[PDB]
Amino acid sequence: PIETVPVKLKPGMDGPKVKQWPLTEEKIKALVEICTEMEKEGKISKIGPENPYNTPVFAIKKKDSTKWRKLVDFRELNKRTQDFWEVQLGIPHPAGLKKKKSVTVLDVGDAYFSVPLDEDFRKYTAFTIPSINNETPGIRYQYNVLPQGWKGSPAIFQSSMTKILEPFKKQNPDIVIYQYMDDLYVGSDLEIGQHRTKIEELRQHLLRWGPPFLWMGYELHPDKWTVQPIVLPEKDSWTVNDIQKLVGKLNWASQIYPGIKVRQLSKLLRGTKALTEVIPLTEEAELELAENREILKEPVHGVYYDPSKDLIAEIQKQGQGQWTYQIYQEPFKNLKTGKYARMRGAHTNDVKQLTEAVQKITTESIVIWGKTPKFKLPIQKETWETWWTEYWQATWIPEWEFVNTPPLVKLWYQ
Amino acid sequence: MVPISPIETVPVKLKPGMDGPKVKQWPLTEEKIKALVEICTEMEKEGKISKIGPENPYNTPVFAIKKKDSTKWRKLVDFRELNKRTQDFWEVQLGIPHPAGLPKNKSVTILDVGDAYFSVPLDEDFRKYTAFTIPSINNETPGIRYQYNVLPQGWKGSPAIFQSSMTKILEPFAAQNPDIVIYQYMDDLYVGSDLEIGQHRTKIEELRQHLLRWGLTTPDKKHQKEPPFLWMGYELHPDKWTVQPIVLPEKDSWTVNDIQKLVGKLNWASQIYPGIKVRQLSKLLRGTKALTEVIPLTEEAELELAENREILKEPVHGVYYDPSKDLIAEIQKQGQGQWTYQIYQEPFKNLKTGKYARMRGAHTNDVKQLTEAVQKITTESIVIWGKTPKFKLPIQKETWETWWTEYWQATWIPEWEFVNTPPLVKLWYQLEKEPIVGAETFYVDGAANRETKLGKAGYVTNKGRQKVVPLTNTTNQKTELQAIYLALQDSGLEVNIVTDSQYALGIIQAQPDKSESELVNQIIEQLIKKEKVYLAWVPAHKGIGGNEQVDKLVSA
Ligand SMILES: COc1cc2nc(NC3CCN(Cc4ccc(C(N)=O)cc4)CC3)nc(Oc3c(C)cc(C#N)cc3C)c2cc1OC
Ligand SMILES: [Mg+2]
Secondary structure, eight states: SSSSSOOOOOTTTOOOOOOOOOHHHHHHHHHHHHHHHHHHTTSHHHHETTOOOOOOOEEEEEETSSSSEEEEOOOOHHHOOOOSSSSSSSSOOOOGGGTTSSEEEOOOTTHHHHHHHHTTTTGGEEEEOOOOGGSOOOOEEEEOOOOOTTHHHHHHHHHHHHHHHHHHHOOTTTTTTETTEEEEEEEEOOOHHHHHHHHHHHHHHHHOOOOOSSSOOOOEEEEGOOOOOOOOOOOOOOOOHHHHHHHHHHHHHHHTSSEEEEEHHHHSSSOOOOOOOEEEEOOOHHHHHHHHHHTTSSSOTTOOTTTOOOOOEEEEEEEETTEEEEEEEEEEEEEEEEEEETTTOSOOOOHHHHHHHHHHHHHHHHHHHOOOEEEEESSOOHHHHHOOOOOOOOOOOOOOEEEOOOOOOOOHHH | OOOOOOOOOOOOOOOOOOOOOBBOOOOHHHHHHHHHHHHHHHHHTTTSSEEETTTTOOBOOEEEEEEEOOOOEEEOOOOOHHHHHBOOOOOSOOOOGGGGGGGOOOOOEEEEOOOHHSBBOOOTTTGGGGGGOOOGGGSSOOOOOEEEOOOTOOOOOOOOOHHHHHHHHHHHHHHOOTTTEEEEEEEEEEEEEOOOHHHHHHHHHHHHHHHHHGGGOOOBOOOOOSSSEEEEEEEEOOSSSOOOOOOOOOOOOOSSSHHHHHEEEEEEEESTTTOOHHHHTTTOOOOOOOOOOOOOOOOHHHHHHHHHHHSSSSSOOEEEOTTTTTOOEEEEEETTEEEEEEEEEETTTTHHHHHHHHOOEEEHHHHHHHHHHHHHHHHHHHHHHHOOEEEEEEEEEEHHHHHHHHHHHHOOOOOOOOOOOOOOOOOOOOSSSOTTTTEEEEEEEEOOOOTEEEEEEEEEEETSOOEEEEEEEEOHHHHHHHHHHHHTSSSEEEEEEEEHHHHHHHHHHTTSSSEEEEEHHHHHHHHOSSSEEEEEOOOSOOOOOOOOHHHHHHOO
């Protein structure tokens, strides 16, 4: 790697000026140790006050690891960096990545440190190691090579990455590989018996052609990822409250599915009855419930993924460690629905459960469409921004907004 | 001649598409011209400036001012036009250390690097823009033109380039002497340590022997201050710290200049004086823009002002930080969205205090405010001390457990313990999960005409109980809340309520205990008196019995 790739920003856009948020002493000392080694390795260099740009940085610990990792929030820089069509006009996402059985996620982010960065773009990667209590000025750095978490890093290295993957693509033709940011998604249709040895075949294969976190592979199983269709209760005795929640659920589902009727189910609530009173189902109302039950068995008609529009992810807290979510581009047109349960390491911490849920949904969104959705988080802004970095474990960061009004749709996704 | 290490210049460029300033020189008096030529003659022989020819097209107006008793003129180059055209820089002097995070440092020596401020050179490719012309006597000879060779006083990039150049020089000294701390601010260096003074001065002389390698004459500060240092509005003593004397005046006609006076002083005093309020004084700050009108004082603001005066009688001092002890923060509720906290390591001696103001909204509760106060103190503690402190909160563990498990949002509070300090934060009401057996079921609804604002609200129950109330000057959303209040008012201790108002559900599901709407507050007061309340929602206009009967009675 000698020649640099001329990287530019979008027309009429200056570099990022994002303020560094406060960091604990353990994270500051960890970043100083990391950046000192990266400075000796030529990956980063000190900068002067003529560089006014900045990008936030913080330290995390990878899943099942005991060493701190330097994570950069390049969200503002990535949206200011130009679209990378310098080689390909746009790679359609591999649809076979979500139909495989066992998908392994590696971290080829360290391989980006072998390719230098355009000297005219290094000033835009500036970051600051903050000091405690403003005792000293923050330690200022900039990247000399391709940094992890930057949009242009996999695009620039895409020319050199394919040359390393060709001897293995020739070996196995029916294996799907996909790269997104600092992660390479490797999926195969064979069982886990040889999957560990097949991924191990790819571990040292990358090192000999050019790594702290390249020894672990996050395993996925998208062939068994369950979906959550609309389900109606099957009861032998229905109270007034049960029928009220039923029609309320069918009225909500009527906006998604055509032909849903609640007329015969309303004629049973005739009169002012107590909520706990059992109402016997008439055969005319049982037919309407059976008709609506068969309508919900079919998928939603007229749904489609548009690569031009953004993806939206809503999350509802259901309690007892259960979180439901929906991904869509248009309202009432869900592209994928799901439900998690038993968040490991977080039984009394909703924030850690929600944080891990955001990571899992974004991971699923990478396999299906190849991009990240904008989250609608059921949490106050001040609480989320204070603690989400403490439980974050991925190299990428999506966008999110906050929901302050309790949604009524929570009762139906439960 | 002893060789000196050159200070590396910082490459400075103008803003893209912009050129240097070309401002005409002001016609000055004969007495000012003679003074400016005499000082620029001295500045030129010291290497600070240098003469140029007529090739430089840029110019910056130079002035001459004089003090009160000092019968000496002084130049003042107005780089206002150049600062508009100079690139933006990275300011490393935005934040200021808080004394509560500074540890004990007995030995202290403050140096003056004033002569080093004008020794840092300027980028040579940029010196042509700092052109200024001294007018000649009677405008009969060409004006003498100079350009700055060093960082000029008043330029945009001068403070940031100086501190960056000073930090770069102090890095090897501050690394090989870990028992020495050095704080940079303006042309002053604050050096402290915990060693005995015998070792301190020797390391001070070592610092003087380190800065002279770049040719920086740094002696002791003239007229060294007394023990109580006056540093950024603080009084810094060896074992304690406090704020400079801040006392509020006794007036009877307060205007808008006194508006930023009381709030400015009380907020700056809340960091060490506990129990300080300012909300009743700040509620008079809604829409006043000018700085001359008078505002009458409400007795709620006068009582709040008098409460803080009693706290500002005797001065309160704070202790310095000790990393070997734990960090503890206790919070107390003061009333109407007012919260105060104390941060300490050993009891009865606080590192600092503070207050949190309720985020203004339509509906709120004490658990949200306490949660928001915890996140505020958490972020502040990471700034000053770099760690989250253990909290002492006036809320039961069972109360918090019931709150976060049933709250629709995700919420979290770091490690905390309950402290019995009234008033305590408590859940005033909890809605039921399932319908109540044996409780009367109230089917409520409301409606209002959008033109005449005439509305109705009421309920129908399974026991035959009914009510419809005509309303004047109301809305659809207001009649829906009115019907809820009527059902709670006319029901027993246990009640099931059936409504179709999504607006009313969103308010009640937010679990507020206080609101700016009097009608919602009446509903909350009704919910507290109850034993069990189940609120159920149904879609409107869907033939639901009890819901459509009460719908036609309010729709007129
Ligand atoms: C761990 O890093 C640091 C720790 C610092 N600690 C402290 N702690 C201070 C030390 C001074 N004392 C009063 C006193 C104490 C005894 C005496 C005496 N016996 O003559 C006089 C005054 C108050 C407390 N001051 C730092 O920087 C200063 C700041 C921020 C302001 C001033 C002023 N004006 C002076 C200094 C030295 C620190 C800087 C650090 O890093 C850059
Ligand atoms: Mg109605």
